[PDB]
Amino acid sequence: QLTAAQELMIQQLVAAQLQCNKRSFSKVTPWPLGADPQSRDARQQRFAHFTELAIISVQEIVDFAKQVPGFLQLGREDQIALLKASTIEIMLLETARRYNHETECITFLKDFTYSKDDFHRAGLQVEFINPIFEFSRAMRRLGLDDAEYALLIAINIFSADRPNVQEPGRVEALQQPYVEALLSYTRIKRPQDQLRFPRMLMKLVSLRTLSSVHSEQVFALRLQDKKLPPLLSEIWDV
Numbered sequence: 325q326l327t328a329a330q331e332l333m334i335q336q337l338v339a340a341q342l343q344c345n346k347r348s349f350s351k352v353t354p355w356p357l358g359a360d361p362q363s364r365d366a367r368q369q370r371f372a373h374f375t376e377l378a379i380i381s382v383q384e385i386v387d388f389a390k391q392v393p394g395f396l397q398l399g400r401e402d403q404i405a406l407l408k409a410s411t412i413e414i415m416l417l418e419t420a421r422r423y424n425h426e427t428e429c430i431t432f433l434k435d436f437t438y439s440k441d442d443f444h445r446a447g448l449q450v451e452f453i454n455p456i457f458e459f460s461r462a463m464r465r466l467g468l469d470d471a472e473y474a475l476l477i478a479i480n481i482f483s484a485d486r487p488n489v490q491e492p493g494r495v496e497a498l499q500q501p502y503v504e505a506l507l508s509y510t511r512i513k514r515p516q517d518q519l520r521f522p523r524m525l526m527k528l529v530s531l532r533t534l535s536s537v538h539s540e541q542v543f544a545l546r547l548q549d550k551k552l553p554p555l556l557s558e559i560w561d562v
């Protein structure tokens with residue numbers, strides 16, 4: 325019982341997500357192969373490889389948001405305020421989406437697959453990596469399809485409570501149709517489990533905390549002179 329209008333909205337979202345991601349292929353610094361043991365330079369090269377993946381992701385996320393129906397109707401100031409806050413959360417959703425529970429690794433851009441050890445080997449701290457993997461496993465147990473991921477991202481974008489939002493009324497009104505679509509879609513997909521929808525919305529709660537956990541990781545780089553490139557530092561370093 326999805327209405328025609330809801331079906332159309334969902335098609336648009338899934339088509340946009342697909343196109344934007346394919347556009348992230350249409351060259352990152354390599355993962356260091358052939359390094360010496362305990363190497364300063366190897367570690368920095370790993371970190372640099374990761375910062376460049378993050379820079380690819382942020383561009384994909386902005387490109388996707390611009391395609392989300394209603395986003396560009398908002399004032400430009402609100403567009404920026406919404407994307408600034410949602411970028412890390414959407415990035416962690418797309419990360420969770422690429423977790424393989426069999427291997428316990430994350431695969432980025434098809435070719436780049438990494439373990440907890442590999443993230444640690446690049447200089448990221450256990451206090452950040454562990455909750456990300458915990459979240460990824462919890463996301464895996466939900467079994468979201470492409471429509472559910474796209475809808476959840478749209479809902480995340482139109483959060484009226486982000487810092488410096490000018491027209492929170494308009495933002496909340498834009499969130500409504502996407503919340504309503506996800507409610508309808510989840511009922512049809514799994515009618516016997518009436519909790520899958522609350523459990524999904526609850527992942528937005530966890531993402532808020534992960535953003536805070538991420539802020540602490542960013543801060544921990546300041547007392548080990550391992551700083552972010554300027555682009556990432558602008559959106560992430562307070």
Ligand SMILES: O=C(O)Cc1ccc(COc2cccc(-c3c(Cc4ccccc4)cnc4c(C(F)(F)F)cccc34)c2)cc1
Pocket residue numbers: 382383386387403404407408411558559
């Ligand atoms: O834009 C492009 O064509 C390509 C591109 C894609 C990604 C990035 C880096 O990744 C991000 C992620 C979250 C937001 C922005 C961001 C934008 C970006 C933006 C654009 C349109 C609507 C909304 C947001 C614009 N202006 C910002 C400003 C300000 F002070 F206002 F100048 C401050 C802080 C962030 C921003 C950037 C930079 C470029």
Ligand SMILES: O=C(O)Cc1ccc(COc2cccc(-c3c(Cc4ccccc4)cnc4c(C(F)(F)F)cccc34)c2)cc1
Pocket residue numbers: 345348371374375377378380381384415416418419422430431432433434443448453456538541542545552556560
């Ligand atoms: O694959 C596709 O098709 C699309 C796609 C392409 C790329 C990506 C993201 O790619 C990555 C890969 C490795 C790390 C990050 C990264 C994160 C995010 C993060 C952190 C730990 C583990 C997983 C993810 C957060 N913070 C970082 C910081 C910090 F200092 F903390 F600011 C520094 C450097 C990297 C990071 C990002 C997603 C989707």
